[PDB]
């Protein structure tokens, strides 16, 4: 599919509402494995199971190890832009 920029709005008291898997140590991109009901990703739409996360708020997640990506993603607050692709 196309590379997509997707808006997600996250208050500080809540998570992103996604689970991720994969990462450089496994030879695959950071992939969305789950979208959790009623949380920001679910509410906003636009993100799907199987999407690869290429970047978040301009921060490159390509070639990032699972833990690195967890750290970066978990630091984002407020209006968050995801760059994803379903490939």
């Amino acid at each position: 599919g196309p590379i997509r920029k997707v808006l997600l709005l996250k208050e500080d008291h809540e998570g992103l509402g996604i689970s991720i898997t994969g990462g450089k140590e496994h030879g695959v991109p950071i992939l969305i494995s789950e979208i959790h009901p009623g949380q920001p990703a679910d509410r906003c739409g636009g993100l799907h199971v199987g999407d690869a996360i290429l970047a978040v708020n301009g921060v490159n997640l390509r070639d990032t190890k699972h833990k690195e990506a967890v750290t970066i993603l978990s630091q984002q607050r407020g209006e968050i832009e995801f760059e994803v692709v379903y490939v």
Partner: peptide, 8 residues
Amino acid sequence: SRWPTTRL
């Protein structure tokens, strides 16, 4: 769930 997963 082939690899480790993290909820965010």
